[PDB]
Write an enzyme that holds these catalytic residues in place. Structure first.
Site, PDB file in Angstrom:
ATOM      1  CB  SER A  45      -1.006   0.034   1.143  1.00  0.00           C
ATOM      2  OG  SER A  45      -2.150  -0.758   0.846  1.00  0.00           O
ATOM      3  CE  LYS A  48      -3.991   0.922  -0.826  1.00  0.00           C
ATOM      4  NZ  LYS A  48      -4.749   0.398   0.316  1.00  0.00           N
ATOM      5  CB  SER A 105      -4.511   1.195   4.024  1.00  0.00           C
ATOM      6  OG  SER A 105      -3.524   0.840   3.045  1.00  0.00           O
ATOM      7  CB  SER A 212       0.670  -4.820   5.456  1.00  0.00           C
ATOM      8  OG  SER A 212      -0.618  -4.442   5.175  1.00  0.00           O
TER       9      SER A 212
END
Ligand SMILES: OC[C@H]1O[C@@](CO)(O[C@H]2O[C@H](CO)[C@@H](O)[C@H](O)[C@H]2O)[C@@H](O)[C@@H]1O
Length: 263
Positions: A45, A48, A105, A212
């Site tokens: 992530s 992002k 997230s 993660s």
């Protein structure tokens, strides 16, 4: 050769059983401290940030783009949709999607940002446009998190991600309003308490984005304002040999605590 900083990071890595990558940029003198800084790691992530930044860049020449509502359909939901699930058969704006992706997230939100950019390659193209020659986004959520050892898909290096995060938040890869917006989002992250932030002096302000994935991949990237001295950028990536390894956010905290010494 290594410095004591690098030796501490190597020892942390050894104890953890995994593979650690660190890059610090100290903007007082633009020096870097690296540990495996040119090795690739799965971003998970942390990617992002690039996707949100790419949409912010688009918005520099479409000032209402961020306020554009996007429909959320039932079928859009993937494996982790804490914000988007509240809007099924409703809408979220690109700003709302960016905030959800960055601050919670939300993986549905990421997939909407990727779609806005025309697919994973649109995120990569933005990276290249801002001088990041290293980042690659290959897949959408959730498969971008498979984190298979040595697989180059959906990877970057600690050095490249630190240089980019500096450009995006302290430099001017984004326009003025947009840079400030990214900083606001990162600063408000809700998922980072156990990662870099847990290792920093408490008087320090920080924006961060965690990641993660499989292979126990545990990541965080941060822009940091220490008390009384110039800001820093810190990237901590970590991955492990076995697919179902547990998260190790504590390793990131430890790495940050090491790096903060002497700053
Ligand atoms: O949020 C839907 C939007 O996401 C994209 C990827 O950017 O597709 C993802 O979500 C689909 C629906 O849940 C999946 O079938 C697909 O495999 C996944 O990549 C867009 O294609 C879609 O418009």
């Amino acid at each position: 050769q290594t410095s004591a900083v690098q030796q501490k990071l190597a020892a942390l890595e050894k104890s953890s059983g995994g593979r650690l990558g660190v890059a610090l940029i100290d903007t007082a003198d633009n020096t870097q401290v690296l540990y495996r800084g040119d090795e690739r790691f799965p971003m998970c992530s942390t990617s992002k940030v690039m996707a949100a930044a790419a949409v912010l860049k688009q918005s520099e020449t479409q000032k209402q783009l961020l306020n554009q509502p996007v429909e959320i359909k039932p079928a859009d939901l993937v494996n982790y949709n804490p914000i988007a699930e509240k809007h099924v058969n409703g809408t979220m704006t690109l700003a709302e999607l960016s905030a959800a992706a960055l601050q919670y997230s939300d993986n549905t939100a990421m997939n909407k940002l990727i779609a806005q950019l025309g697919g994973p390659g649109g995120v990569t193209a933005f990276a290249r446009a801002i001088g990041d020659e290293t980042f690659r986004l290959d897949r959408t959520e959730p498969t971008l998190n498979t984190a298979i050892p040595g697989d180059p898909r959906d990877t970057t290096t600690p050095r490249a991600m630190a240089q980019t995060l500096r450009q995006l938040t302290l430099g001017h890869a984004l326009g003025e309003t947009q840079r400030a917006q990214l900083v606001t989002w990162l600063k408000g992250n809700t998922t980072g308490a156990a990662s870099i932030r847990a290792g920093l002096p408490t008087s320090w302000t920080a924006g961060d984005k965690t990641g993660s994935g499989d292979y126990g991949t545990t990541n965080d990237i941060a822009v940091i304002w220490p008390q009384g001295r110039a800001p820093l950028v810190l990237v901590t990536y970590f991955t492990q040999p076995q697919q179902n390894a547990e998260s190790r956010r504590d390793v990131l905290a430890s790495a940050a605590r090491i790096i903060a010494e002497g700053l």
